[PDB]
Structure 1
Amino acid sequence: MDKKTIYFICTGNSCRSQMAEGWGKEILGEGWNVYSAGIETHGVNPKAIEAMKEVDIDISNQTSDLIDNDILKQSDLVVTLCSDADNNCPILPPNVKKEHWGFDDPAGKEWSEFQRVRDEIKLAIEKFKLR
């Protein structure tokens, strides 16, 4: 079996989707190619980078990307991580499955909020692996 493809989407491919990609590559790596994108590109959020450093994962060289239809077409699961991404997700290929895993936006808050959301994302990906 070829590896499956999971595509994490948030508003700016900045924070939630970047943490999801960082965790995903570690947790899902044996079975999955992991990509992330956004409605816009805001760059990788500095507090998200710091949050991932605390769990020994470097996301500082991950890319902030717009949604790519070729990746959409080849996705086994598209995961929207916020309301903007979910409400503005482009029309998907008819055979491509999408789920919304909503997480709070730590935007503009203390580092603790990034730690909180980081770890909610970690658990969601761990559960997903074992579905």
Structure 2
Amino acid sequence: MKKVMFVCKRNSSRSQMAEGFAKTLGAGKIAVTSSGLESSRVHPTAIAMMEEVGIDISGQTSDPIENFNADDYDVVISLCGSGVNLPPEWVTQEIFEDWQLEDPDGQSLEVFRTVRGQVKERVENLIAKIS
């Protein structure tokens, strides 16, 4: 078992999703956390759109990434391409991955369902390489 941070360049009004799927798919395998890069909260829409899958994320972002320690986490997932707006210790973890995905913010429920499909496959691949 190992710890994973899931993040985007900014978190205010962004849905991200992959953190909620990673603990719903693999919490007996890995520990998952999500954080802001500045003082923020995930999309209020994200809770209801991840709850279509039964996913529990009501208050998951409480603190910025820079409030934590990077070396606690073997993996850091940047969901919006590069991490860039975070300290260098988070890009230097062993499984630092840049995922070039979209965010559901500003677009339809069909895009939330599209992102859930793409993210499910990405998160299952992540777990199946870090297992």
Shared fold (TM-score greater than 0.5)? Answer: yes
Aligned residue among 86, 103, 106 for 2:83: 86
Shift of 1:27: 1.4
Q: Which amino acid aligns with 2:115?
A: V
Q: Which amino acid aligns with 2:51?
A: K
Identity, in percent, stands at 36
Q: Which amino acid aligns with 2:103?
A: D
List, as ranges, runs of 4+ consecutive aligned residues in structure 1 with deviation greater than 3 Å. Answer: 68-71
Aligned residue among 79, 84, 102 for 1:104: 102
Shift of 1:34: 0.5
Q: How many residues are treated as equivalent by the alignment?
A: 126
Partner of 2:120: 122
Shift of 1:53: 1.1
Shift of 1:89: 2.7
Gaps of 5+ in 1: none
Per-residue CA deviations over 1:78-123 (Å, capped at 9, x if unaligned) read: 111114x622231116962211012112221122212211221111
Per-residue CA deviations over 1:62-93 (Å, capped at 9, x if unaligned) read: 2343113643121101111114x622231116
Gaps of 5+ in 2: none
The Cα RMSD (Å) is 2.2
Q: Which amino acid aligns with 2:11?
A: G
**Given the two structures, how large is their TM-score scaled by the length of structure 2?**
0.81
Matches within 5 A, 1:1-131: 3-10=1-8, 11-12=10-11, 14-16=14-16, 19-68=17-66, 70-83=68-81, 86-92=83-89, 96-97=93-94, 98-131=96-129
Is residue 77–residue 96 contact of structure 1 (8 Å, CA) maintained in 2?
A: yes
**Given the two structures, how large is their TM-score scaled by the length of structure 1?**
0.81
Q: Judging changes above 3 Å, is the alpha-carbon distance between structure 1 residues 57 and 94 closer, same or farther for their aligned structure 2 residues?
A: closer
Q: Judging changes above 3 Å, is the alpha-carbon distance between structure 1 residues 109 and 93 closer, same or farther for their aligned structure 2 residues?
A: closer
